[PDB]
Structure 1
C-alpha cells in the first residue's frame, strides 16, 4: 500500500475547522466537492529523513493505514481515502461529530450503572471485532471514544485514532509503545511483550473513570503515575465508589491485573454478569 493518491487534495475537498491536533498530526473537517459528503482529514507529517524527529516514519504511517483499511465495524472509524503530498500523508476518514463520550455524559443529569453499561458494551463490541482480527489498539482512552452524533436517542460509539494499532500475529509484539500513562497497561510501562490483553487493561481504567470520575492510577508526576500502573496501586475510594455495585467492582478488578495472561479477555468481559446479568 506504499503509493497513495498523489493529487492535490484541495482539488477534491474543501477543508475548514480544526477538530484535533495530535503530535505530528492535525485533523480538519472537510467536504468532498464531488458528493457533498463531509469527512475528517488527518494530516500526518512525514519525517522524510530518518535523522529528522519532526514527523512520523513511513512505517508508522503505513501501519495505521493498513490497519484502518482492514476494519469495517459500526463501532470503529472508517477510512475513506488516502492522499500524500511531499510533506504529509492525508487520511480521509469518516467524520465523527458527536464529540467525546465523556463530554456527552458530563451533561447528563444522572447516570445509572445500567445506562453506563450500554455505552460500555459498544466499546466492547468494537474491541471484540478488533481482537477477532488479532488487532490491538494500544491507545484506548476516553479521548478516543467518540459519539457519531449526540442528538440521537441512544447515540452510537466510534473508536478512533489507530496510530498505535498493531496486528499481533505471533501472540505478542515487542516494541516500546508511547501512550498515555493513565491508560497504558503495566507491560507497556515495563517494555515487555504486548498483546490484545493490554487493551483489556485500558478498558478497565475507562470503566473506572466512567463510574467515579476519578482516575485510578493518576499520580502527582508522570513517573508516579507509571509506578502506580506497574504496582497496580489503585483503590475503590469510598468517596467515589460508595454507591457503586459490587458486580461493577468485580468487573474492574478482573481487568486491572498486572499479569496479562490472567487478565480477563474481551469475550469473557462480554459474558461478565455486570455486562449481561
Structure 2
C-alpha cells in the first residue's frame, strides 16, 4: 500500500527518544497544525530480500493494517503513516505513562482487589481485539503501558502490534516467535495458533502481577521452553500465601496446554474472580 510521501518534518517537530527496538526507534513528536503530541515510530525497511536487517514490507503492511483497524480505549491508536526510501514512519498515540509493572513497583503494595482493576482493563482490550479476530501474539509486561501515571485512575494501553495477526478461517498459522517466558506451548512446539495464545500470556501476566515472580522462567533459554511445553509451574507458599483460591483457579484455567480447553476471553470476563 502507498503511504504519505511527504517529509515528516514538514508536519511534526522531532524530539526526545522515548524507546528503541532492534529494527525500530520511537521518538516524541508534536504536530505543528494542532500542537498535539504523538509518538513517531521509525521502522527501518528491509528493501533487500536477502538482507536480514530491517522489516519486510509484508510485516509492516500487516502491523499498520491491524492498527488502522483498532479503535479502543485500552489499545494504542494509529494517527498517520509516512514513508521514505529507508523508513516507514508510524505516527502513534503518545503513551508516556511507562510500564504498568514499573508503576506498581511503587510500594503501598497492591491489594488483590486493586490488582484486578488493572487486569480488568487488559481483559477489556483483549476482549475488543479477539472480537475482531485479532491475536496480539506478544502480550507480556513491557507491552502493557499506562497513558498517564499522574492521575487517580491510570489507564492501561496495550501496545506493539509487530506480531499481531488476523486469524482467518481456513489456512492455519504456526510460526515460532516471541519471548520464551511469556509464550504458549503451541508457539514453542510450532503447532497451529489462534486467539488461545493471548489467553495463555494473560495467565502468565496475572501470575506475575499477583506474586512478582515468573511461572516458567528458568535458568536458561532451553529450560524455560521446557517448563512452558511441560506446563510445569507451582503456587509456592512463599509467593501465593496471600492469594485467594479464586485468583489461582483463574490462572489454572488459563495455564493449560490444550488450546481448546483453555478459557476464552469471554469466559475470563465471567469468571467469579473477575465477576
For residues 167 and 178 of structure 2, the distance between their equivalents in structure 1, rounded to whole angstroms, comes to: 18
| CA offsets 1:100-126 (integer angstroms, 9 cap, x no match) | 100111113121110000000000000
Instruction: Please say if residues 185 and 198 of structure 1, whose CA atoms lie closer than 8 Å, have aligned partners that are also in contact.
Output: yes
2:3 alignment partner, SS class: coil
- Structure 1 stretch displaced more, 128-137 or 173-182: 173-182
What are the ranges of 5 or more consecutive residues in structure 2 without an aligned counterpart? none
Q: Counterpart in 2 of 1:139?
A: 138
CA contact (8 A) 1:144 1:159 kept: yes
TM-score w.r.t. structure 2 length?
0.98
> Is the deviation greater in 105-114 or in 75-84?
105-114
CA displacement 1:167-188 (0-9 Å, x = unmatched)? 0012773231410111111100
The runs of at least 4 aligned residues of structure 1 exceeding 4 Å deviation read none
State the partner residue of 2:222. 223
Bigger mean CA deviation after superposition, 163-172 or 121-130:
163-172
Q: Could you list the per-position Cα deviations for residues 114-160 of structure 1 after superposition, in whole angstroms to 9, with x for gaps in the alignment?
A: 00000000000000000000000000001001100011111111000
SS at match of 1:14: strand
Q: Aligned partners of 1:189, 1:23: CA distance in 2, in Å?
A: 22
Q: What displacement does 1:92 show?
A: 0.3
Deviation at 1:237, TM superposition (A): 1.5
Look up the SS of the partner of 1:17 in the other structure: strand
- Cα deviation, 1:214-246, whole Å, max 9, x if unaligned, reads 000000111111111100011112111111111
Retained in 2: the 8 A contact 1:164–1:177?
A: no
Matched-pair contact (CA < 8 Å) for 1:172–1:194: no
Aligned partners of 2:148, 2:204: CA distance in 1, in Å?
Answer: 24
1:128 aligned counterpart, secondary structure: helix
- TM-score, with structure 1 as normaliser: 0.97
Whether contact under 8 Å (1:171, 1:195) holds in the other structure is no
Distance 1:107 1:163, change over 3 A: same
Structure 1 position 7, deviation (Å) = 0.7
Q: Taking structure 1 as reference, are residues 240 and 96 closer, same or farther at Cα in structure 2, changes over 3 Å only?
A: same
Asked if structure 2 preserves the Cα contact closer than 8 Å seen for 1:172 and 1:193, the reply is no
Say whether the 8 Å CA contact 1:7–1:83 is kept in structure 2. Answer: yes
Taking the aligned partners of 1:20 and 1:245, their CA distance within structure 2 comes to: 37
Mapped to 2, the partners of 1:173 and 1:196 lie a distance apart of 12
Q: Distance in 2 between matches of 1:173 and 1:35?
A: 44
Structure 1 gap segments, 5+ residues each? none
